[PDB]
């Protein structure tokens, strides 16, 4: 699982892969780790597939019962204190890394990263999942803050594609959605139209010369591809 | 420890940090993980500081006793089969990730990555150490093969600096050396003249607004920096 959420001027861009894998076997290759809480507030979802699904639909029922009694819109800081309350009083029993990102008219675009420990940190961009450790040095070099909506979509799709190329846990589709003052626009690009893959990376075309022919010199001349020559 | 070796047209560029750390305390902040085997063949050195030091000076005595009896130069493939022989018949007792890179007149610049399992793989560039997992997605995006000698030095110094900015195990100086047909040129750039650091990264200047003032609205207005206001 590689999940991330990046803020721009208008709102936020949620990004995630699509694969639940029982250790080493792909149980599902079209998962949806972008969970709707309210219309403009979603959450990314990593870790245990059952422990985080039960939290996401328990928060989303407190959060819709709140919205009816208030009669107004729900702030993102409200939804991020319902995950922190539940991920802290269950922190020894669940495995839950949650990234809460959304839009509210008061504060604009907000990103909250709630790790497995149960803390809450408000950010500009957040990373999560087992594939997130590849993306710290990728965002230190290639990420500049203050992009547009069209640039954050193509960046976060290029960000996830570098993550599941090296990670074995992550893979599949790339599901992204933007949350701002307009309608929430979702987009799912496949594997075969992904912006990066190592199989078509032109520097991994040459095989590593392991299987040397039996020869008279120490001059390395590539692999042995035939029984005759 | 973050070690790497990258090939260009002439020869190779070895790059490493300088820190041996007993778990959580910096025992040495000026280590030298670039070990001389012969004049033109070095090895990077990760893992156990004692188990890899004993291998590096046992190979370097077999390799200099070989060079005297031959009366010619040592190939890099010769030195990489003396680490593979020793890291495989001791693989349950040592902790040794070795990157062997050098120069010979027959094959030019060679890079061999010998992991903890004891295998040998000949590469174009190699990565090693606990800080290497940050640099796969950094080399998938920012690395183009076929650079010059002056470009591989400034790249590998920029590569290590992104690695020990996120890694806690790695840090300190950046020791690089180039091995080609000229004399071996070494260079040690410090921390305060490193090409990257998160403390002077201009997107981590704004503190994450955690410590909110006690207020009447949900409008987030930054941290509380004084007791009065």
């Amino acid at each position: 699982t590689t999940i991330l959420a990046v803020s721009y001027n208008g709102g936020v861009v949620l990004a995630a892969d699509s694969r639940t894998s029982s250790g080493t076997y792909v149980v599902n290759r079209a998962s949806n780790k972008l969970t709707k809480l309210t219309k403009k507030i979603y959450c990314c979802r990593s870790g245990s597939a059952a422990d985080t699904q039960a939290l996401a639909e328990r928060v989303s029922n407190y959060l819709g019962s709140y919205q009816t009694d208030i009669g107004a819109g729900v702030n993102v800081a409200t939804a991020a204190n319902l995950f922190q309350k539940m991920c802290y009083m269950n922190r020894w029993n669940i495995s839950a890394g949650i990234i809460v990102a959304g839009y509210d008219p008061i504060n604009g675009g907000s990103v909250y990263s709630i790790p497995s420990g149960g803390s809450c940190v408000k950010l500009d961009y957040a990373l999560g999942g087992s594939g997130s450790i590849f993306l710290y040095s990728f965002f230190d070099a290639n990420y500049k803050p203050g992009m547009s909506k069209s640039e954050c979509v193509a960046f976060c799709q290029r960000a996830v594609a570098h993550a599941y190329s090296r990670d074995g846990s992550s893979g599949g589709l790339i599901r992204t959605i933007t949350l701002d003052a307009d309608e929430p626009e979702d987009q799912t690009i496949p594997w075969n139209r992904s912006p990066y893959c190592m199989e078509k990376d032109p520097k991994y075309v040459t095989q590593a010369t392991q299987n040397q022919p039996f020869s008279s010199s120490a001059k390395i001349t590539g692999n042995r591809m035939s029984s005759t020559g | 420890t973050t070690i790497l070796a990258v090939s260009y047209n002439g020869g190779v560029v070895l790059a490493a940090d300088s820190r041996t750390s007993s778990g959580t305390y910096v025992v040495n902040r000026a280590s030298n993980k670039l070990t001389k085997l012969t004049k033109k063949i070095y090895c990077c050195r990760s893992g156990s500081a004692a188990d890899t030091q004993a291998l590096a000076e046992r190979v370097s005595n077999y390799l200099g006793s070989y060079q005297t009896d031959i009366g010619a130069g040592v190939n890099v493939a010769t030195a990489a089969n003396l680490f593979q022989k020793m890291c495989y018949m001791n693989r349950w007792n040592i902790s040794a990730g070795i990157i062997v890179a050098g120069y010979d007149p027959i094959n030019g610049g060679s890079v061999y990555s010998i992991p903890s399992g004891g295998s040998c793989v000949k590469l174009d560039y190699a990565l090693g150490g606990s800080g290497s997992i940050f640099l796969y997605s950094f080399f998938d995006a920012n690395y183009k093969p076929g650079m010059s000698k002056s470009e591989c030095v400034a790249f590998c110094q920029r590569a290590v600096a992104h690695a020990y900015s996120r890694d806690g195990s790695s840090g300190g100086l950046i020791r690089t050396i180039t091995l080609d047909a000229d004399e071996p040129e070494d260079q040690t750039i410090p921390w305060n003249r490193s090409p990257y650091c998160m403390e002077k990264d201009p997107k981590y200047v704004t503190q994450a607004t955690q410590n909110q003032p006690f207020s009447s609205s949900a409008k987030i207005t930054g941290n509380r920096m004084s007791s009065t206001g």
């Binding site: - | 041996t20 280590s31 156990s48 500081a49 004692a50 030091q53 004993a54």
Partner: protein, 219 residues
């Protein structure tokens, strides 16, 4: 243990404490931890008193035996190689942390040997249990090319960070200066903990303990 070392302008200065404890009680208060290796090489030691003394005397007799053959002054790099191959081939069972200092024709050589067998050649090293508290004094006040007096006081002010803060260390500062020509070993250089409130000396007269038999044997 709070053994330290510092490279100064011409030579090295080795430092140590004197406390030796066997299981939370102070066994000895004036133990000696700076050992002899050569006329130009000394060696501090931490860990177990059995393993430190027996790795040192074996190598220091091997360096002496190798000195009669060569007829020359012994290197500190060959003192280090004999220590690191012994401590490696027992795989950390010989629990001795070492600080090795000496002077050769190539200048001062200060390096440490871990109990697993790894070596680090540095301008200043600390080993033992109070090595963390003694390093923070060295990281705050070391500079290149210090005099013999400024290095002897920097070493002694780093031992007292292990005396007054580490419970496994104290009671004195041992300082050994290694030069090219001579070698000066002081034991009572800094005794910050004196004897406050000298003893009442409860007097018992000779004969007040009841004795059942006694047998006197003249010599």
């Amino acid at each position: 243990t709070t053994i330290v070392g510092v490279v100064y302008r011409d030579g090295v200065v080795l430092g140590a404490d004197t406390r030796a404890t066997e299981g939370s009680i102070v066994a000895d208060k004036r133990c000696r931890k700076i050992h002899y290796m050569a006329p130009n090489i000394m060696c501090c030691g931490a860990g177990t008193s059995a393993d430190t003394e027996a790795v040192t005397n074996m190598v220091s007799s091997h360096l002496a035996l190798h000195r009669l053959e060569t007829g020359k002054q012994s290197r500190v790099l060959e003192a280090l190689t004999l220590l690191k191959r012994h401590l490696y081939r027992y795989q950390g069972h010989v629990s001795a942390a070492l600080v090795l200092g000496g002077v050769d024709v190539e200048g001062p050589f200060l390096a440490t040997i871990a109990p697993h067998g790894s070596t680090d050649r540095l301008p200043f090293v600390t080993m033992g249990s109070g090595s963390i508290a003694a390093m923070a004094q060295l990281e705050a006040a070391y500079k290149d090319n210090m005099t013999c007096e400024e290095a002897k006081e920097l070493v002694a002010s780093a031992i007292r960070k292990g005396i007054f803060n580490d419970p496994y260390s104290g009671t004195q500062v041992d300082v050994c200066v290694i030069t090219k020509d001579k070698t000066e070993l002081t034991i009572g250089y800094d005794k910050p903990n004196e004897r406050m409130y000298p003893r009442q000396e409860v007097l018992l007269p000779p004969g007040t303990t009841p004795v059942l038999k006694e047998e006197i044997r003249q010599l």
